[PDB]
Design a protein around this nucleic acid. Sequence first.
RNA 1: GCAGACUGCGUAGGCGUGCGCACGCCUACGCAGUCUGCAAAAAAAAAAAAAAACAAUAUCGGC
DNA 2: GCCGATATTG
Length: 1265
Amino acid sequence: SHITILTLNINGLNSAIKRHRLASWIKSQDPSVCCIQETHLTCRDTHRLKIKGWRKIYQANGKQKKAGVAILVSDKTDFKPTKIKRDKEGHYIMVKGSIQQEELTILNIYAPNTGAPRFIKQVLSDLQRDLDSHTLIMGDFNTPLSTLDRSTRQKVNKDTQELNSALHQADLIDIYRTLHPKSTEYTFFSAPHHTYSKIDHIVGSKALLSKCKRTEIITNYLSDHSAIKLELRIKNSTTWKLNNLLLNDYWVHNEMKAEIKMFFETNENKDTTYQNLWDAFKAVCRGKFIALNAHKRKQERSKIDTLTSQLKELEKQEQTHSKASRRQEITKIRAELKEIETQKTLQKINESRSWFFERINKIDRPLARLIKKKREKNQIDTIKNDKGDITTDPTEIQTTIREYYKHLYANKLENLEEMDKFLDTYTLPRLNQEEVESLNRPITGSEIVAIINSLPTKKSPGPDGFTAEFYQRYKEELVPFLLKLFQSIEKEGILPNSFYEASIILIPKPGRDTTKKENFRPISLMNIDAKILNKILANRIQQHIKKLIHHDQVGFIPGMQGWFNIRKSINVIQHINRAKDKNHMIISIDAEKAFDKIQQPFMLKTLNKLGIDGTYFKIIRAIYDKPTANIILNGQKLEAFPLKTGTRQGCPLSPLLFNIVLEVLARAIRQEKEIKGIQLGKEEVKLSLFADDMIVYLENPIVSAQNLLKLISNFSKVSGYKINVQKSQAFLYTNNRQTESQIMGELPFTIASKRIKYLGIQLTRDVKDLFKENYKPLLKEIKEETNKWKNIPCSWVGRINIVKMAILPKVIYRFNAIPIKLPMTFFTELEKTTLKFIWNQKRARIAKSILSQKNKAGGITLPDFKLYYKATVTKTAWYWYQNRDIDQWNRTEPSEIMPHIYNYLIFDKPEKNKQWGKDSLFNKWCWENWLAICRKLKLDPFLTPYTKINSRWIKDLNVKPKTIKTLEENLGITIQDIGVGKDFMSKTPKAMATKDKIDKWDLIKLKSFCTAKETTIRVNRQPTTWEKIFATYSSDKGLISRIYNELKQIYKKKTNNPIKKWAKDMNRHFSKEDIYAAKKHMKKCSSSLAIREMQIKTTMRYHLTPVRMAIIKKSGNNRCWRGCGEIGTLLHCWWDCKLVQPLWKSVWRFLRDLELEIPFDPAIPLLGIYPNEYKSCCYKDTCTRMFIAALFTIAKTWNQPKCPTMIDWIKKMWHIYTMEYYAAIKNDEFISFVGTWMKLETIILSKLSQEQKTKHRIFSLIGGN
RNA sequence: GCAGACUGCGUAGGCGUGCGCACGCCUACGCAGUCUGCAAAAAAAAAAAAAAACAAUAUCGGC
DNA sequence: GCCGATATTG
Ligand SMILES: Cc1cn([C@H]2C[C@H](O)[C@@H](COP(=O)(O)OP(=O)(O)OP(=O)(O)O)O2)c(=O)[nH]c1=O
């Protein structure tokens, strides 16, 4: 073990290309510590020095752009800083700390070029107290220490002798001279003097020499000065993870195909089982990927390799003898190396910039991680230990964590008889024979390939490096081998030993003290193939889960939505409020460390008791046979500690198995008649909640809660399911204070007299406070959450997407959970804050009406929270119409009236004089909203094509229910299928059969009703989209989106369109076709949202012109902000301005140079409204980019007397060109890109001179140079 | 010259209250009218994907 | 419809 410390005088870091190339070179050297001098960064520019892959970066920056220092410590180096001193001018930075329990004192110094020894001595006197036997003084000393440090071999000056004396008194020595007494190497070459000299030195105490390993001066072309690289011995491999980018090269892809094929053609035979063969293939592919990555790195910089080899040989020749022609050749080849490295670094940085440009403002990773605060460092370094100690020692903290989790997962409680007794007491659903054989059906390549295709991307790999992009890429050839492996696994029931491998990582629990070990959630990364097998099993069991779990559970269950329970719970609480005798309670049980306290033997026993037997259960038992988990703590893979209990918390199959296991407890609670839950109408609602979270409602708590605790204790004893009774709240209701007190006594639960947080919702003790506890906070939160974004660096489009991404999901979730009649003040406040954020505390530049309108209007669909609220509220009508027996949440309401009538009211008569209850919280408001929408559509909502066969019309025909059952089971469910008029029972042979099968009285009743003229006309008319939205769809997926789109269409205000105003001030009527074309162009002018944002801003008259400012300020100066002396109308500023005209004239010179005779029409560039006769999109693709570049050019200098120069337009065009080039290469759209850019590149290259393009880095990309 | 706030006029729908009318609230709505952040923009931001998984749900968009 | 991305609950 050695510590590599590197020092370098980079002579400024302003050049980004030089920054990264030093950052790429420093990556190659892999130093343990790096000291950098003359960063040319200010305290304001500390943001600039942000390098990926390195976190602990300490900076000392001066005010001016002359100095500034920083120290980089390798992530492989565990330096624990204690005290830091920084120079206000960057000449020095002090840092005291320890490395691996070895104290280390590091000093960085940049002495002035003149009189450095005196300045250094002053630093020594100031830091005399800080020097110890572990001192490292670094930086730019600006002086040589010995005669051998100068090429001229000139005597060390008297200042050096005094400086050396000062170092000697401080027991500090020149390490390089000590370790290389006879080395005459030098770091900097002085061109004016033609002399080499070693003026940067590594100085430390002699005691460190025993630790010192090796020091060397590494001549480099990245800077005039060479770095000194010292290795320091300390008292004594990471996991390989495949890189997605590696798969993008064709050569490596073909090589991997060939390697896979040759392996499975060579290593296949009878003597080996397919599991061990698969593991061997994994290892071989791992080694092959490592080797081919090395080969790819070699080839990619092979030119650099040969050039640096030539430089090494010629530099050795120079050192042994220096020659003038050798000097000039060395200089030329060094320039060649610089140009090649600049080429590669520009490639890399522009590829990154293109990636950002393609996602600059979209709702995507860049925006999501811009909005989110800087990630809190999950790398733990000190935790309140078991007894009382905070602790910091890495090995002791690792031991604490590892032992904690090893003890957590090492418990099976082998008491199978007790598990049998518990399971054979609460009869629970069993899968029929058909479903059993469905689970055990053979694995099909179609199934595996479907899983692979659905396999999430951009996900961390498991203990093996393969990252689920590897399987997708080699899907076509791997899938057969995966199928063979799964066939072997199902036949034999033994998994490859690599399947059990998993990597636990400790993610902090939000809102919890990270210093406690117990507050970390261990999430598991599993081998992707193991995850494929587990996803297969999870999908298999999921095909039958609906009948396997009661609808009380809505966590991890397809098609069930969490808000169900919320509404249910709230209804229950409302009932409690309305009850005369309030003797009841609700408890929010929260499982402690669920998925980890689950006992695998009990889970397997439950699955066996469920009828899951055979191949599927064999594989389930195998996957839990010998699971293992390594804890990747601080990047170190700790020991294995096989987890004897719990279910892997990152496994696809774990949620389903946990739900199945806890369904046993749910069934037990429901069966127990002495745990009587609240009774609403004709339904019993004992308990319902997400997977591990449970909420129970109980009557007569004194006894029911005690019985519940007894049952939970039995379940915990039998299965390990433990509840943290302390962190498990409850509302208690009793009409006697003494009863409340004694219940508090017996019950071990903490009674929350105000509220309970529950699925992100503040359930309120009294429902009347719901809003005050749920929306008023949320609204306030949004305000706060947006106030910290006041200065967020995003454009109005970026802010709109930020709202849509961060606030909208939160607001919609709140609406879904609590669709109570919200006062309009809430929506006014929410819209006000949202808009104010979007326009950063200024007046909205674009009309809210324009943006709110659909994307057809060219905008970005500024979300309308009022319409989202209405959509969410009216959504419940879908469940009303469906009348599902599982949505018990809907039927739990005040029962003043016959509660059964809710599935009605949708496409059936209104029960005039019949009230739904003043106490109704959700359904009454949904009814009001649904009626409002139906009235707005001016449709009849009581008899429609989708009226169910039995809602009230047939019922009001006093039809026997058996007749309704016959009609339902024969033909369909809607009146339409029955038919009306001529078509009554006259459209299918089954219709005739039913017509014959009904009794004469009911038959004639249906004849009288259906064939009536009014019903015929009201049922036959084609159904509107709003009705298909609640009848045609049998699934509630995407329902809010569809309802909101329909509402958007319905409530589409007639706004003051700004394209029409462009027509007006251009005195030229635009045809509807012209408006449509302008909107289409604004929609698809470019993929990147910066280009589209520019086009949208120009089209929507975003830029406020001197006319606007004159009117608002009432000042008469309408003169354009350029000295043009004309009126400052928008068309002037964009098109008609003598200072803006030359740019458009140049653009038209380019157009004609492109053999394009297009009219000199402002509409074409400013809006894309091409003349009707001109429709050749081939040239439009280029013209759009040319025009938008011109628009950017004008906008940048939108108000300066400065003329938008041609060169600015060229530069912006090339910016777009490079971004699109790399984006297309990554997206494989290269042919279209060349088609739309080749001629333009040719003209641009011809127009410019070599000097100008070189200065602006305008080297061609499509064509070689 | 865009928009919201907001005064008033007023259409219609609903809910609650009172004895066809009156009151209170809300919705959607057009009109006239006062403002009102204001320099001017491009700041560059980096904003970084890349590590920390899993199930389900919702949203958005592009194809 | 798919196919990416984001948040919501665990
Ligand atoms: C929050 C979260 C939960 N889960 C799963 C694993 C958990 O066992 C299960 C329930 O989570 P929670 O109930 O939210 O957490 P918990 O009950 O395990 O924590 P505590 O013991 O302190 O109450 O959901 C994840 O897989 N990933 C996650 O990020």
